[PDB]
Symmetry: D4
Subunit: 180 residues, 8 copies
């Protein structure tokens, strides 16, 4: 195939992140060698999810994203059958042991307002918290509750804009934006 995007994704993200995004796509019948613009998105979404859980206390979050589909639903059941939160219809990204809610992390190339509206329409669970990030530096969260401290969220926005700059420096950003 030989995509400049694919080689950039392998140089941009940590090797363990690339491996999980590969397993995530293959589990859903997708090839990172051809769906390279996607490939960059699951890597980006995975890193943001891991930096998100890195914020806060040690035992605060339970990481759902990055596990296999069967195991992620197993941990979701264990969380629901121990706390009492209703089972979400779709797989969330994290669970906040401090606020007692599931968190859906979103990373958008378009306006934060549109994605969240698209995400909120999907999740009929209602109780699931939504937190959206953009590649321009904006963010949007449910009830204006941004969960983490400002410094942890600012670190995520900075990294997102760095991925955007490195992509545009290789003339790959325009195709990345016009693909979501």
């Amino acid at each position: 195939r030989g995509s400049h995007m694919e080689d950039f994704v392998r140089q941009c993200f940590n090797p363990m992140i690339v491996e999980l995004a590969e397993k995530a796509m293959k589990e859903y019948g997708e090839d990172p060698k051809i769906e390279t613009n996607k490939f960059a998105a699951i890597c980006t979404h995975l890193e943001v999810c891991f930096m998100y859980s890195d914020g806060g206390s040690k035992h605060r979050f339970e990481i759902i994203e990055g596990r296999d589909r069967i195991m992620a639903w197993t941990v979701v059941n264990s969380i629901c059958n121990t706390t009492g939160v209703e089972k979400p219809k779709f797989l969330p990204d994290l669970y906040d042991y401090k606020e007692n809610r599931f968190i859906e992390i979103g990373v958008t190339r378009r306006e934060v307002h549109i994605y969240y509206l698209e995400k909120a329409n999907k999740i009929k669970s209602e109780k699931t918290h939504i937190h959206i990030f953009s590649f321009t530096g904006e963010e949007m969260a449910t009830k204006a509750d941004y969960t983490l401290d400002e410094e942890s969220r600012a670190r995520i926005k900075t990294r997102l804009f760095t991925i955007r700059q490195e992509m545009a420096s290789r003339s790959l950003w325009d195709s990345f934006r016009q693909s979501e």
Copy 2:
């Protein structure tokens, strides 16, 4: 022997946990290859004990469980001869340097109410704190003092229900429950 339980225990728990539970059973004349349902219990009890001490401050707990019988009693003596707490009749699991008391950790497959009553009858030391966990997500502690924060205890309950789900997914949970 070739027990599905034994292979599940080795896949479910961290290798160091399995090694300590093996040494614990062998020290008391028990073979994990035949007493597989037990084998899963010492592993579960060991992990809960280690996640428990992982909660709280750095120097808060002294881990008694997981040591050899002679060395565990040596540390118990050192704690008693330095603080002044009475020597317990039976080996506890942890010592809380913050609350100045020994902690007995229990993990039950039956109702939390029965196990604690069974545990409290045994410990005539009285001063020893009891903290029970169940595979269904409930917990019971002495004087309603649960020692740790809610997030640390919720992480233990979630892991316990995951072990239950993985066991039932292999048709091994029913024999595990009807063996305590």
Copy 3:
């Protein structure tokens, strides 16, 4: 799913071997959680291939098995376009830099005579060397040329019979044999 085979495969083989066999099946639309008898075969075939290359000199073999389908064909092309050997129709397992030939490694649960005959009918390349191993301790190679020393091949047969014993000790061998 919860298969005793799946847990045995994870306990029997080295973790890196299990990961490569997982990626190998998923690349060809197969799930190790349901195709557990297969899952044990790619792991077994992978280990035999790696012990095979472990025999002989340092730079003797080029390992084709265990790579992704695209990369394995890239190395096959490089070997053909540098030595002059004809491109095989199917992906082989190794290349012998000493004998200047590709090697197809086979591991059979049935009689070695049948598998090799089945393998030789497939490879019209003719030049590709075939080396078959069985779980009973027999082996068969092209032109009676067994490539490696007797000690290296004996180590492979011993390991194969150990996998057979561990499988039969868990009542999983009968289903493994009646599935090839």
Copy 4:
């Protein structure tokens, strides 16, 4: 070349620090083998920058110094395009996610009063925070805001005076002072 300074710098500083200072000089057309007094300064400035970021919270600082010139400006842009701080004219050393400002770290062999005055004249950005350290144990910061706790800044002053003592013990301090 064979400079006593060069061998002292390699023995005094951590190997990773020496490698970054080497790459920093070579990127700007300087050879650490001849510009040995300089070589000791970029190493010293690099370590102080890393101990500075080591103070405070986990996600507090973004380390600009120690990166390549192109990548450091990329992170500066990402910070400016996400928070809104004006782009500084010169490359700073850190960014404080807590106070929302860039920090310029200075290490002087002369009086702290002169260096800061020289530094403040250069940075027309105004918003950039300046923090100066000396090899005698004094420090000077903008608006008397020293950012970190006293213990973290005291650790930096102690290390600086140790470098001075080790240098003077080798008769290399006098040439180091008369070279800034």
Copy 5:
């Protein structure tokens, strides 16, 4: 020589601790193979010093003990020439960046009251803080200021009584006590 004490010291303490105590004795013309009772004391004193600095914040303490005689005095000078504290007459064990004072750590086999009185008579520096521990579980500190939290000091007392029990279990404690 073949001393039971020497083999116990190597089994009781961490290997890095044993190496530093060896270098400490040899620097002062002492052989751990014959002065085995001493050998156990520098190891004990070294571990207590390291557990002491392990208490408190990250940048709180500067470890003087465990360095070579020349380097320890270099760091003492740097601390004195940066904070302003008077140079102590004898080498202390730690410096408290929080309380701005040097700390002398003592471990006694006799009554805590006698050792501290012996230590206080030696240090004419006056400003140096003294903190004594005993193998029986008692402690004594200057101005009743024990610097660390109760849990960190209780961990040190517990370890000291464990060393006493292991020594007495080998009939080596009586000679250890009658040698200070």
Copy 6:
């Protein structure tokens, strides 16, 4: 218990060797804390077995000693069912893939002539090769076939005499000799 032997064994042998000898004794109902003279023998026998297999080629030997009783018999069966050698009545120490025979390694504190005669009377398998070492530097092997090169066997004799010297230097050798 507090045995000088036990502390010497932990200081003399590599930690992994001590762990295997511990598991070996406990599997056969023996406590290394009281049976200390024995404890030194399984450690010595284990190291000699590992240095023995270290001699020769890479795939030459299959290590039977050091495995659990069930797994060692599994590998013995695999070797017998693949080569054709008769199943030995007692567990041997190694299998020689080069000479096609099992090897029984013996380490004696008495005369090599007596032990081998005692060993040969036990093994009715006849085909099993016997190789005896002594703590004085002598050795005896079946059919005068010493399997390995002279340098590898000389390294084993040297190590054995070093263990003897270290034991006698602690007045533990006399009890060690009068206990076989």
Copy 7:
């Protein structure tokens, strides 16, 4: 800059190789970010040099390439002043302790005949051995003496053709060939 070549070079070669080629170019006033086609050549030449020394015995070769210019000439002097070989006019790549000669390794994108002729004209040292490799699988060496075994040289040719295939798969080979 954002070159597809630069990202491919970082994905194709081992990270340590990329670091040495970076230091090699910067030492000679070249930037791998703009001279990307070159950047791929020093990486390729470096790997071939390291695989070359990997062939043969343990102490056979002394690696000159990959060191700094000053240190490489130091080792060249030591080799000349100990064996007696004349000092070469230009820095070679290796020294063969077996054949007692320096080796110049060449990797060409054009015909092997032209490069060697260009190389031989440069080296007036005459005694220096020349060994050329091409990306098509051919090789040329002085006096038809190819130094290493066929398997080691075949491994180098295979890797070279793999780099060519990966480059052409990204449409970067044509610019790579038309740049030597």
Copy 8:
């Protein structure tokens, strides 16, 4: 002290070598901080001894140099009491299990002829093999038997001349030569 030699020795030799030479001098009442020219010699002698044993087979040599005085004599006794070689009067450097003799390694700054004559006069053991190296590239061995292959000895001579060049590049060689 601050010696350019001391800093060069720490930069020139591997850290483990420097630590052993430090322990070797301190065991004999010598300080590497003042006896810096010596300090460079024990490091040089230690490395040559380790490269010497690195030549030849795996179990060929027993390394005597680099151990403590008591332990080195213990291994010497074990070698003498197992092979039968007479106990040497002075501590040798290695034992050759292949040739059955002790080896004394010498490194001279003067003529090889003088040192060996000085060494041979000392060793009345006669059976001990002597092998001398010089910093100019010459060597001298007993009975013209140089033990190792030419390539292994040539690697030692090359390293010795590199140490000489690095020393002379720092104006430290002249004092090093005029101190033996």
